[PDB]
Each structure stands twice: as C-alpha cells, then as structure tokens.
Symmetry: D2
Subunit: 42 residues, 4 copies
Amino acid sequence: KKKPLDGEYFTLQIRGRERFEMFRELNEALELKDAQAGKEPG
Amino acid sequence: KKKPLDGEYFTLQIRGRERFEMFRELNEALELKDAQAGKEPG
Amino acid sequence: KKKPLDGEYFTLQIRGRERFEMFRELNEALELKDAQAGKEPG
Amino acid sequence: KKKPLDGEYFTLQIRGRERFEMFRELNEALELKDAQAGKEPG
C-alpha cells in the first residue's frame, strides 16, 4: 500500500478557471483507470 | 498591446510522463480555439 | 432490473483510426465514473 | 480538388446529451489541428 517510486511528476499551467475544472475532470478519469489496473481482475 | 490582463492561472500535477504528453495536447487544443475567438469575422 | 431507461443516445463520426482510439478511451473514462455514481456509499 | 480520399471513418455512441456536447468539443479541437497541419509554413 503506497511505497517506493510512483509515476513521474510534471505540471501544466491552465489559463482560465472554467476550462481548468474541465481538464481536472479528465485527470481523475485517467487516474481512476490506473487504480483499476493493479486491482485483481476477478 | 497584449497587457498582462490574461484569464486566471491555475496548475495541475500530472503523474506519469506518458499520460502527461496526452493532457498537454488537449491544452494546446482549447488554447487554439481561444486564438480563433478574437479573430475578426470576415 | 436494468430497464431500457438509460440516458439519451447520440453519436459522433471520428475520422482517422488513430484519433478514433484516443476518443474511445475518454468515453470509457467518463462511463466509469457513472458506474461509481450509483455505488452505495460506505 | 478535395478528393474523397479522407482518413478512415469510425463512429462512437455517446450516452447522455450532457456528456455528448463535451466529447463533440474535443472532436473539433483535434480536427482544427489537422487543418493547421496542411498549412504551408511561412
């Protein structure tokens, strides 16, 4: 549960708060799939 | 001319370099439309 | 059980097979969140 | 002139009208870059 090296770590400047929330949504979307990857297929 | 009065300015931490390049592409996509918004009609 | 009362149903023509696979990935991303929405809290 | 030799042609069923408008926006985004690809440099 959480330990050695995680994935790399970059950043991105998003101008405008409106579109900002839009990108954040896609961010959690991809990160969610990653959590389903190391999960037993069952 | 130009003026520092741009929209707000936020940021986002994108883990993984692979997924990073993916988000960056979408960023330039929306920003491109913004440049076409201030384009005088014809 | 299930019931055909799903949300609306539209479509989108994606030219290019390369870009096609890219959009399809985002589709499953949002749909995944929907499945977590009806997940009873705990 | 033009020629019907465009890229492949696939499709995608997007449930929900709300999320539909979201994907459509990304579609025009990538297509815009394609139009800038065949733009003679200067």
